[PDB]
């Protein structure tokens, strides 16, 4: 007799159709506040339009608040990066925005040496066994 | 001594193979013939029209139910399941055609994809003597034995077999033609309409 075990599938984003990780970016600035100058300049100066043209799968919100200027991204996995861009020039802000768009949303993490590939798949060759080895030990 | 039991049930005791390899019609499972059954089934289903080609063994499998011979001989279940899935989609697209999306959650559509309707279709086409199954109590009406469900399974099993062998498009075409068609009058749509009318009356 055979019975099922209720189990769910694991989504690999890349393999079938690539859904782009960055979904939304919020440009936040202040009209007062000298720290928000470079952000304000960026918003003004035709760069944002070009960016939006380049990346039509990201939505680009533009908000005004009293505090420091902010770049909060929003990713497919549900995580949210928020970069404060206080006192940065236009070009630095743009670089920060580029960095954000590049990111897959996942948390930052220490990797050990050669911790390269991350598989869900069972090994193509088996796992080693001392009884089934080619050269028997002594 | 090799006592093979050949009568009523003794619990645990093995039977003679010929005592459980016969349908309610009474034909031996090994003794089925191409000329006398599978060819007839093909002719009924009009498989030469739609470029269809099923194997004799496949046809036999589609015909036979899990209850026959304790699932020893190859039986329709997975095929049936597949056919049902395809059939429901096919009924939905038909409803959409006749673009509308407000004619799905309705009685007629349900009846079209129903088990009773499928059984009636099977009966009309006269496939009931060919199928292999075991009755619950031989001296009953038919519905008591779970005949209708088996017939529905057979209808869907055929569809699932067609899907497997002859592709999806071909299956869809077959569904449009033999079933789901007003010109035949013993098609699935007509049956569904009749059922609806009966429900209205009652």
């Amino acid at each position: 007799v055979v019975k099922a075990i209720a189990r769910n599938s694991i989504g690999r984003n890349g393999v079938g159709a690539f859904v782009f990780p960055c979904r939304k970016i919020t440009l936040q600035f202040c009209n007062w506040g000298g720290s928000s100058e470079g952000m304000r300049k960026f918003l003004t100066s035709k760069r944002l339009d070009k960016w939006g043209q380049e990346f039509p799968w990201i939505q680009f919100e533009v908000m005004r608040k009293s505090g420091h200027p902010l770049l909060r991204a929003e990713y497919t996995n549900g995580r949210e990066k928020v970069i404060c861009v206080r006192n940065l020039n236009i070009d630095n802000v743009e670089n920060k925005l580029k960095l954000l768009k590049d990111s897959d949303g996942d948390i930052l993490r220490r990797r050990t040496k050669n911790d390269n590939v991350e598989s869900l798949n069972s090994s193509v060759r088996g796992i080693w066994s001392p009884l089934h080895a080619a050269k028997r030990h002594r | 001594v090799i006592y093979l039991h050949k009568g009523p049930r003794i619990n645990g005791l093995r039977r003679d193979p010929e005592s459980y390899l016969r349908n309610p019609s009474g034909v031996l499972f090994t003794e089925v013939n191409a000329k006398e059954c599978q060819d007839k089934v093909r002719s009924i289903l009009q498989l030469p029209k739609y470029g269809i080609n099923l194997s004799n063994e496949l046809i036999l499998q589609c015909l036979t139910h899990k209850s026959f011979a304790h699932g020893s001989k190859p039986y329709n279940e997975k095929l049936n399941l597949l056919g049902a899935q395809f059939l429901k989609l096919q009924t939905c697209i038909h409803s959409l055609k006749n673009l509308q999306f407000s004619n799905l959650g309705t009685k007629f559509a349900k009846e079209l994809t129903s088990k009773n309707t499928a059984c009636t279709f099977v009966k009309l086409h006269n496939l009931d003597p060919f199928i292999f199954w075991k009755m619950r109590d031989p001296i009953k009406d038919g519905h008591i034995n779970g005949e209708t469900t088996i017939f529905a399974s057979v209808l869907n099993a055929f569809i699932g077999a067609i899907l497997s062998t002859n592709g999806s498009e071909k299956a869809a075409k077959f569904i449009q033609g033999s079933l789901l068609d007003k010109e035949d009058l013993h098609s699935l749509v007509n049956i569904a309409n009749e059922n609806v009318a009966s429900a209205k009356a009652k």
């Binding site: 007799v1 055979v2 019975k3 099922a4 075990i5 209720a6 189990r7 769910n8 599938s9 694991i10 989504g11 690999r12 393999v15 079938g16 159709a17 859904v19 979904r23 939304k24 039509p56 799968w57 990201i58 939505q59 497919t76 996995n77 549900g78 869900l120 798949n121 069972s122 066994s129 009884l131 | 499998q61 899990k66 304790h70 699932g71 020893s72 001989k73 190859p74 039986y75 329709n76 279940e77 997975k78 399941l81 597949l82 899935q85 395809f86 429901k88 989609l89 939905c92 959409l96 673009l99 999306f101 004619n103 799905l104 959650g105 077999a161 899907l163 497997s164 062998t165 999806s168 498009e169």
Partner: protein, 324 residues
């Protein structure tokens, strides 16, 4: 003038936009556009259609609004048109998912047991999984109130872009759920949305490219990892294997010790192989002899069921599950 009147007319306008989903308004909605670009949806699939797919059925406001004291308030959504919701679409999408996924599974594993197959299908297209997929895509729920939106003075475009159902405000506030039906659940709404999108895609492409929908499904749904070997749970597998052998033209299976080490220890190792004739069917390692024997039988059954033929082979229709 009066602010109530201003609010009322805004609400009316919003309701009218919901009823219509006018194409220009839908186009203006940035969230919809970004969703469209993200999924690489066809150009024939209009933005109005996409908005509709996000619109769940919500004809009449329910009786549970009368008392927030009983732990529910439905103040976010606005009533929808009877003949312009995601409901018919959703059903069609569900049917498509049930057909195509199942077919793909059968192609992959033509002998897979019925229960196991059903479980696999569920895994591929369960409601929770579908909801997760929708979240990943970026189908956000209209959590904000109508009044709040009016106060902010946001356009109707944004509302159209968001997912719209009777989402209960104060659903789990103070740690109190109300346990309402499927018609007020977020997960269900998200599932409907993903099915509705699929249905919309099908509607637009069917005449031009019939298999476009199915390749979209393959890309999104069938691309997900599922190890079918983890799905099984046998009971008395040796008996089942013997039955299978009887059914086919195979000799009776017997288990035999291939290799052995550490007998008379806490953790031995016994390798046993279930032979049918000289051919080995299943290989089974174990701490005990019995365990090893069991494992060999389970391995044999796995090899029987999870046999995946090549695409170049002619179709393999299995002879049903091994009824023990």
């Amino acid at each position: 003038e009066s602010e109530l009147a201003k609010y009322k007319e805004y609400y009316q306008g919003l309701k009218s936009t919901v009823n219509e989903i006018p194409e220009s308004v839908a186009s203006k909605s940035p969230s919809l556009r970004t969703l469209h670009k993200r999924l690489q949806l066809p150009n024939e699939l209009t933005y109005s259609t996409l908005s509709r797919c996000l619109t769940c059925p919500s004809a009449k406001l329910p009786d549970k609004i009368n008392n927030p004291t009983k732990g529910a308030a439905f103040v976010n959504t606005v009533p929808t048109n009877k003949y312009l919701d995601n409901h018919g679409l959703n059903i069609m999408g569900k049917n498509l998912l049930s057909y195509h996924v199942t077919k793909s599974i059968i192609q992959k594993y033509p002998r897979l047991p019925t229960v196991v197959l059903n479980a696999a299908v569920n895994a591929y297209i369960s409601e929770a999984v579908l909801a997760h997929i929708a979240k990943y895509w970026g189908i956000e729920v209209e959590t904000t109130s109508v009044l709040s939106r009016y106060l902010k003075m946001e356009p109707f475009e944004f509302t159209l872009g968001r997912l719209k159902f009777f989402n209960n405000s104060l659903n789990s506030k103070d740690g109190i759920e109300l346990i309402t039906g499927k018609n007020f659940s977020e997960t269900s709404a998200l599932a409907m949305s993903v099915r509705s999108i699929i249905a919309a895609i099908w509607a637009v492409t069917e005449q031009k490219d019939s298999q476009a929908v199915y390749r979209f499904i393959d890309d999104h749904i069938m691309s997900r990892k599922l190890d079918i070997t983890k799905m099984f749970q046998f009971e008395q597998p040796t008996r089942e294997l013997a039955m299978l052998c009887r059914r086919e033209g195979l000799e009776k299976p017997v288990s035999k010790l291939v290799a052995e080490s550490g007998r008379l220890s806490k953790s031995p190792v016994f390798i046993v192989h279930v032979f049918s004739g000289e051919e080995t069917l299943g290989e089974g390692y174990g701490s005990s002899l019995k365990e090893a024997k069991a494992r060999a039988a389970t391995d044999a059954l796995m090899k029987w069921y999870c046999y995946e033929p090549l695409a170049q082979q002619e179709p393999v229709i299995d002879p049903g599950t091994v009824v023990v």
